A paper describes a structure:
Penicillin-binding proteins (PBPs) are membrane-bound enzymes involved in the final stages of bacterial cell wall synthesis on the periplasmic side of the membrane. PBP3 shares 42% sequence identity with the corresponding protein in E. coli and has been identified as the primary target of a number of β-lactams used to treat pseudomonal infections, including the cephalosporin analogues cefsulodin and ceftazidime, piperacillin, and the parenteral carbapenem, doripenem. PBP3 is a two-domain protein comprising a C-terminal transpeptidase linked to an extended N-terminal domain. The active site of PBP3 is located in a long cleft running parallel with the β3 strand across the lower part of the transpeptidase domain.
Three isomorphous structures of P. aeruginosa PBP3 have been determined: apo-PBP3 at 2.0 Å resolution, PBP3/carbenicillin complex at 2.4 Å resolution, and PBP3/ceftazidime complex at 2.6 Å resolution. The SXXK motif (S294-T295-V296-K297) is located at the N-terminal end of α2 and includes the nucleophilic S294, together with the α8–β2f loop (residues 407–409) that forms the base of the cleft. The SXN motif (S349-S350-N351) occurs in the α4–α5 turn, and residues 328–334 (β2c and β2c–β2d loop) form one side of the elongated cleft; the third motif KS/TG (K484-S485-G486) is positioned on strand β3 and, together with residues 530–533 in the β5–α11 loop, forms the opposite side of the cleft. Unlike in PBP2a,12 which is relatively resistant to β-lactam inhibition, the catalytic S294 is positioned favorably for acylation in an open substrate-binding pocket. The three conserved structural motifs interact with each other via a network of hydrogen bonds: the hydroxyl group of S294 forms hydrogen bonds with the side chains of both K297 and K484 (2.7 Å and 2.8 Å), which are hydrogen bonded to S349 and N351, respectively. The position of K297 makes it one of the possible proton receptors from the catalytic S294 during the acylation reaction, in addition to the possible contribution of the β-lactam carboxylate. The two loops connecting β3 and β4 (K490-A500) and β5 and α11 (S526-F531) are disordered in the apo-enzyme.
Author numbering: 50 to 490, 500 to 525, 531 to 558
The structure:
Amino acid sequence: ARSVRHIAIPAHRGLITDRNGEPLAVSTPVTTLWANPKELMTAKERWPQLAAALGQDTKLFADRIEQNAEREFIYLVRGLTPEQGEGVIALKVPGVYSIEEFRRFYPAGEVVAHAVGFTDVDDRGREGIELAFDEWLAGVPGKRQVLKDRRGRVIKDVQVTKNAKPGKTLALSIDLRLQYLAHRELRNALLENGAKAGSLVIMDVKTGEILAMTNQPTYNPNNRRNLQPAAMRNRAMIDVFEPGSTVKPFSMSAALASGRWKPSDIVDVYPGTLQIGRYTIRDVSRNSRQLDLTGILIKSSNVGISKIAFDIGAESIYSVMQQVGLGQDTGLGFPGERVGNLPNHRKWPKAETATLAYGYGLSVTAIQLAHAYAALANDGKSVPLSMTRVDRVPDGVQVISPEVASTVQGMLQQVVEAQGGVFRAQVPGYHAAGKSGTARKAYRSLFAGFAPATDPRIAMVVVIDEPFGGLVSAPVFSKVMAGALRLMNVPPDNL
Ligand SMILES: [Cl-]
Ligand SMILES: [Cl-]
Ligand SMILES: [Cl-]
């Protein structure tokens, strides 16, 4: 009696590197021992020795084999070293066989854990890039057709072995050097402030490339035995929050594009509150009367952006926020990535208009906020997001007019640089631009910005759990932007 089995030959999984060729996921040959239980069952006297070699409990091992006595294949140990494998084969236990497999290892470990993600016990991607690019990376298994007896041993092949085709190499957009910098500074900020979680995204505003994307807590993908759910969250891509004051720049972009506001136009925000029906809008800083558009950003005046929003209508604000991708499906095709929500109310009442304009009327991810700021930095042109290295840059879409984008860039440079501004976000050597806010989901300190002002190269978002924006997250923007700019050999623009 017979059977014909088709056997899959494992294909070498494609190498993942960072944009510079540094190894992030490597399929490395391992020896895994498997057994044909029908054969093993004829050599029970060998089991205890086999089990000792496997460092396995004799009872559990024996039970597992008896449990599987009618199967022709089970694994004994996977991902051993060649040496260790041969140690066991030398035992010459009937029904024990060795095969070359490929096991994934992650050389950068926790540093790029969430972005790279990892594979299953079957070498199929299950988080991050490994998941998103599985087909590119996996290649195609080879096939043997094997004639087997009822033991069931291989009698012969019944056709030519069809060799596996290796997966393809993949270079990420991530620059491991920037990734590491962001990773460490985020972590220090958390430790200092007694906060539990945070994210940090760095984008190339010219190419759409995600140069860094780090979250805390994080985890070691090479050892996932004591994992906790909170550590596995790729927060940059899956935590959503109301961005608050960080989207005022997009509200201002609508104001400018409306034809009705110039940067130097004034709004009276005294006495720092504004009664809307039953509701009261309140500024945190309430020592202002007249503020120009830049002053509204500096003071984070909710009252101010609200009065502007009442003037230009929420539709225009919605349109800018949508075009820059806030709450939109600019997804890179990572299963599970969040889109957030930018409700198209179509007609907004005062309350909703105001709440949208000062950023508590939408939810976004850190990645969208970074991409939005990248378009702004890129003279209003949005280059499509990428987590893989971009050699041929796609044409951008003009989502904010170049003139409005340049104008808002200048205002944001002032919130960082001007008196009463977010001085802690200043980056020595460069003109930096950006905006603080308090995100809500539970509050988080936010800072979002880009640099250098004169020919922006990167956009960055810092999100930190708050047990304020300009106090907690701003100094992190400063330090990380200071490092990243220099890592990219960006010439200092403060001359
Ligand atoms: Cl593991
Ligand atoms: Cl959630
Ligand atoms: Cl490309």
